[PDB]
Design a protein around this ligand. Structure first.
Ligand SMILES: Nc1nc2c(ncn2[C@@H]2O[C@H](COP(=O)(O)OP(=O)(O)OP(=O)(O)O)[C@@H](O)[C@H]2O)c(=O)[nH]1
Ligand SMILES: CN[C@@H]1CCc2c(ccc(O)c2O)[C@H]1O
Lengths: 240, 285, 56, 338
């Protein structure tokens, strides 16, 4: 008698939990997850502050009735990375790096070199084999100010820039002094080489030239994610 | 010799049709990793193909070898109904798969919400109901019977089971089963090819300096196999009714039997993913 | 920094160096004796009848 | 100066090595060679638990051998019922990243932690019939890795900032702080009498601590890579560890050195979980090879393989009375093996 009543009580509760899980399944499947990562003094705080308007940090923003959920890690500041295993199912990884910090030395090698080493370590990780990277080249005006009418030259720090030519396909912004563009494309190619060294056709890179005051980052994040999902779906069916 | 020779082929064909479909069905059912929304269409197609290979092929083979129908008229009608049902249901499933691929590729952000395990069952049930409504209903009733003397004589006799139809049914069934699910597939695959070309062009523009052989080699196979298998029959079906004394019975039977061969190639086309391969080794050994 | 931090390690190793150690034979015998003594109360090692298995 | 101090420590480390070497009278394999082998062991799954939307990282058997808890990436702890395979509770989380969970000895509290450097404690039985956050412990500067209920009022946890601390639930403030590791701490286990506990760090070292005193006692330097799992012998005088180099080693507190190692030439994958049996004869360990292995503690001979998971196994636990063993994997399915 008590047995029938309780088992009847227990059975109902499994049901009210299964209904709740079924309701939450659609919400879980709709959203997209991103991981925000970058070196120090790059400008991550300004970007996330601009994005919100309109030990961990979460931001929830909706574009075109699509839910994005971005994670930024600031509590864990260690050279060794073991918590990165939990981020093997994210849609994309956002990388923010200061483009103009070629001159600054942390004594240490130029920061660009540490950033490039970090990118190399991220790219070849075993658990991040099939995760794309969205690259933000921040501080677009400090670099121009340093390049134009500047005593400092990047050949002393980066020697290969002297033996370089600006790409024919490149399309410049209005009235750009010719050199600054060469410097930007040199910096971008130093990342594209690492990206394409061991791409294997499973994941790519999306370099971008973004300033801090720019308000179009929210569109770039949406478009790159859409392209990533489309490419993954095409590759699943053996069409690319 | 001959009669023996044809018999040898009609057993190998039956075995090939049965084995692949049953293997696909058991591989999908046994493993929980392959339980996907897309895979329900594939198992529906495999079930239809298995029913075809187990119902219509052997008895038709016995008929053609013996050259005499040794069963009642009711069983002849049942055999014709099963044939029409299976043929109709073996194509709209391919159309549904093509539409699913179209939605998955062209609408990536809304793919999850559009298709759910609840809606896939409804779509499959609707396809099966439509396929069975045009097969059993107008065949069990005599709406499809012809009027010329040869058809009447064969209907009266209990030893001949041949296919005689009027223009209306021969046109309506062909339009419902073949012609409609062809333009949809053509348009869908053209759109998919355009999207793939656009993505490849974008990649080449992005990083061409540092760095249509797969798209064609896939789409051409997928479309051409079905088109070559099922095209001539669904032309002669209208031709031999529009003008009599033009198509011989032997050509009709040959084209109809060539159409049946398509039922053995579906696993070789839609089940070539690495997941299906890994699973196949475990079930087989 | 290292000026005393290095010193701390030196003190700890000392504290960890003044301890009594028994021969591995005695510890091995004790472990084997315990395993033999409690070998009749492990359902995983000895398959019990299905009547008393709640998971069947 | 500073170099001179460094020289002094190196001379000592030797003395320790010489003293440890002078103690090894005979190997554990030599003394245990006439025991009849257990032979082949066959285990088949009895239950399959579904309902987790993402991969599973942790689980903890109840003290009544009936209930258990688990955590996943969708931010939810689910309390199961192994006998009748029906759910009991479903606790949503504020953060979606969790790496550990615990179950109270009295069954009244459940704790969990993760990427956020905060440990949260829930009250299962309370007024109004809803699970409700009871306390939130903060102060660590690194992510948590494990936490075990020392009692119904005080909890000990280890974090990723090379420290372990003993908390007080009522006041929410640290009481004792343990330090001495160099790499991140990944696992710990408490003694049956709840007096000492061990921890395995990322610098290939394991230490023995004293809860009351608050100072380290001994150190073992057997492994050669990171240590992910650790378990403690039922007798109370031994423990076993698992490392990324696919080797399990059995140390000993009284002799203070390792006794036997378990390694095979056909495996090059990592190890995520290690557990013992009720009698201590069988050592069960999970790997990254999508399956589990069953060893023999006193002979280092495999006695069976537990397969059935489509992805790597991240959790493992043997119930108090030794009725069955449960495994959790990234396939979001929990299984009970008997
Ligand atoms: N003019 C200019 N200033 C920039 C740019 N990016 C960053 N800054 C400045 O960099 C200074 C310090 O860096 P922040 O932008 O605060 O960001 P951060 O120091 O990287 O902070 P976190 O992201 O939290 O690590 C601020 O005064 C910003 O205005 C840029 O593109 N242009
Ligand atoms: C017995 N052979 C039948 C005859 C007519 C017919 C077939 C297939 C599909 C159709 O829509 C048909 O109208 C053939 O398989």
């Amino acid at each position: 008698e008590d047995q029938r009543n309780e088992e009847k009580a227990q059975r109902e509760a499994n049901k009210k939990i299964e209904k709740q899980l079924q309701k939450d399944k659609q919400v879980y499947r709709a959203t997209h997850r991103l991981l925000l990562l970058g070196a120090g003094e790059s400008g991550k705080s300004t970007i996330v502050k601009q994005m919100r308007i309109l030990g961990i940090f979460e931001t929830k923003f909706q574009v075109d009735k699509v839910n994005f959920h971005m994670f930024d890690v600031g509590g864990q500041r260690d050279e060794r990375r073991k918590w990165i295993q939990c981020f093997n199912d994210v849609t994309a990884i956002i990388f923010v790096v200061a483009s103009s910090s070629y001159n600054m030395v942390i004594n240490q090698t130029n920061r660009l070199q540490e950033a490039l080493n970090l990118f190399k370590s991220i790219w070849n990780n075993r658990w991040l084999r099939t995760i794309s990277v969205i690259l933000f080249l921040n501080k677009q005006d400090l670099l121009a100010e340093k390049v134009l009418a500047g005593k400092s030259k990047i050949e002393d720090y980066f020697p290969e820039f002297a033996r370089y030519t600006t790409p024919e396909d490149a399309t410049p912004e209005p009235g750009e002094d010719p050199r600054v563009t060469r410097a930007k494309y040199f910096i971008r190619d130093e990342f594209l080489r690492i990206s394409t060294a061991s791409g294997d056709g499973r994941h790519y890179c999306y370099p971008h030239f973004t300033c801090a005051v720019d308000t179009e980052n929210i569109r770039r994040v949406f478009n790159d994610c859409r392209d990533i999902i489309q490419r993954m779906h095409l590759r699943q069916y053996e069409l690319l | 010799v001959w009669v023996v020779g044809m018999g040898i082929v009609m057993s190998l064909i039956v075995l090939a049709i049965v084995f692949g479909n049953v293997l696909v069905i058991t591989a999908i059912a046994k493993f929980e990793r392959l339980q996907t929304v897309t895979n329900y269409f594939i198992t529906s197609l495999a079930c239809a193909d298995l029913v075809m290979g187990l119902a219509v092929v052997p008895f038709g083979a016995a008929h053609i070898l013996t050259k005499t129908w040794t069963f009642g008229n009711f069983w002849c009608e049942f055999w014709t109904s099963i044939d029409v049902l299976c043929v109709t249901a073996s194509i709209e499933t391919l159309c549904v798969i093509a539409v699913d691929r179209y939605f998955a590729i062209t609408s990536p952000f809304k793919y999850q919400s559009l298709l759910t395990k609840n809606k896939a069952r409804v779509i499959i049930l609707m396809v099966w109901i439509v396929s069975g409504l045009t097969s059993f209903l107008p065949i069990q009733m005599h709406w499809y019977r012809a009027t010329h003397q040869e058809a009447i004589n064969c209907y009266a006799e209990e030893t001949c089971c041949d296919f005689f139809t009027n223009q209306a049914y021969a046109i309506a069934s062909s339009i419902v089963s073949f012609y409609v699910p062809l333009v949809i597939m053509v348009f869908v695959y053209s759109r998919v090819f355009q999207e793939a070309k656009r993505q490849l062009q974008k990649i080449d523009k992005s990083e061409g300096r540092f760095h249509e052989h797969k798209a064609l080699k896939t789409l051409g196979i997928i479309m051409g196999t079905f088109t070559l298998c099922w095209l001539p029959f669904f032309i002669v079906n209208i031709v031999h009714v529009i003008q009599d004394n033009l198509i011989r019975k032997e050509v009709y039977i040959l084209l109809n039997w060539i159409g049946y061969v398509n039922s053995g190639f579906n696993p070789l086309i839609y089940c070539r993913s690495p997941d299906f391969r890994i699973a196949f080794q475990e079930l087989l050994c | 920094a290292s000026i005393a931090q290095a010193r701390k390690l030196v003190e700890q190793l000392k504290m960890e160096a003044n301890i009594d150690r028994i021969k591995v034979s005695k510890a091995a015998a004790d472990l084997m004796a315990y395993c033999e003594a409690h070998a009749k109360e492990d359902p995983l090692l000895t398959p019990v009848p299905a009547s008393e298995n709640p998971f069947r | 100066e500073l170099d001179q101090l460094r020289q002094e420590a190196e001379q000592l480390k030797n003395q320790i090595r010489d003293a440890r070497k002078a103690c090894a009278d005979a190997t554990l394999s030599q003394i245990t060679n006439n025991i009849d082998p257990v032979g082949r062991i066959q285990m088949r799954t009895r239950r399959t638990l579904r309902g987790h939307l993402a991969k599973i990282y942790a689980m903890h058997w109840g003290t009544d051998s009936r209930l258990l808890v688990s955590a996943s990436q969708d931010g939810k702890l689910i309390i199961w019922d192994s006998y009748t395979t029906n759910k009991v509770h479903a606790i949503p989380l504020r953060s979606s990243w969790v790496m550990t969970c615990a179950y109270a000895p009295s069954g009244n509290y459940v704790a969990c932690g993760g990427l956020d450097n905060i440990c949260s404690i829930y009250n299962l039985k309370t007024r109004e019939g809803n699970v409700r956050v009871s306390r939130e412990l903060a102060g660590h500067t690194g992510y948590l890795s494990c936490c075990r209920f020392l009692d119904d009022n005080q909890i000990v946890t280890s974090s990723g900032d090379t420290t372990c601390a003993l908390w007080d639930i009522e006041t929410g403030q640290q009481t004792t702080t343990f330090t001495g590791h160099t790499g991140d701490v990944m696992s710990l286990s408490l003694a049956p009498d709840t007096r000492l506990f061990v921890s395995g760090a990322c610098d290939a070292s394991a230490k023995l601590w004293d809860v009351r005193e608050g100072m380290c006692r001994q150190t073992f330097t057997g492994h050669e890579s990171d240590i992910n799992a650790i378990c403690f012998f039922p007798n109370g005088n031994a423990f076993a560890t698992g490392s990324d180099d696919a080797t399990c080693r059995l140390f000993d507190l009284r002799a203070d050195q390792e006794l036997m190692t378990y390694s095979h030439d056909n495996i090059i994958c990592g190890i995520t979980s290690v557990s013992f049996s009720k009698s201590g004869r069988l050592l069960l360990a999970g790997y990254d090879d999508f399956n589990c292995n069953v060893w023999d503690a006193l002979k280092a001979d495999r006695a069976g393989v537990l397969a059935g998971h489509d992805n790597r196994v991240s959790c493992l636990g043997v119930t108090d009375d030794g009725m069955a063993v449960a495994t959790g994997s990234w396939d979001s399915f929990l299984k009970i093996w008997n």
